[PDB]
């Protein structure tokens, strides 16, 4: 589900995939994206929205 939602959502902003290394108390996910400028929007606003999506 975490792959499919970001594949459906980030498809217009140059999405390739995600990489995850599990650590205690820190879920460190790396969106390996082509266009790094398009995925942030405005100082990482869409990233802070996606953190709230994962949190909710």
């Amino acid at each position: 589900e975490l792959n499919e939602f970001l594949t459906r959502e980030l498809a217009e902003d140059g999405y390739s995939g995600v990489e995850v290394r599990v650590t205690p108390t820190r879920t460190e996910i790396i969106i390996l994206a082509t266009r790094t400028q398009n995925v942030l929007g405005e100082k990482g606003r869409r990233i802070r929205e996606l953190t709230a999506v994962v949190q909710k």
Binding site: E1, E4, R8, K43, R48, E49, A52, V53, K56
Partner: protein, 96 residues
């Protein structure tokens, strides 16, 4: 669909305190799964969101059986115009 006024104001306050909001698509479900403190149905929240989605104030993202909303700049003005709030304060998604 008829909606309670205080619950409508609570839903718009929950939308203003964080513009992004999730929902689970389920017909046979009495109350909302996330917002479980205030006893409100999920169908009223879905209709109140698609009423803004149809006239163009929110962006929709669709999962397998889940709905996701993304607040737009017109919704930024609409929420503060409905809640009569000063324009200086911003939601949490505008904060670093």
């Amino acid at each position: 669909m008829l909606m309670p006024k205080k619950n409508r104001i609570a839903i718009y306050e929950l939308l203003f305190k964080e513009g992004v909001m999730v929902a689970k698509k389920d017909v046979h479900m009495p109350k909302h799964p996330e917002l479980a403190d205030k006893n409100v149905p999920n169908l009223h929240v879905m209709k109140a969101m698609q009423s803004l989605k149809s006239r163009g104030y929110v962006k929709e993202q669709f999962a397998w059986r889940h709905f996701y909303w993304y607040l737009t700049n017109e919704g930024i003005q609409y929420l503060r115009d409905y809640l009569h709030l000063p324009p200086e304060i911003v939601p949490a998604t505008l904060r670093r």
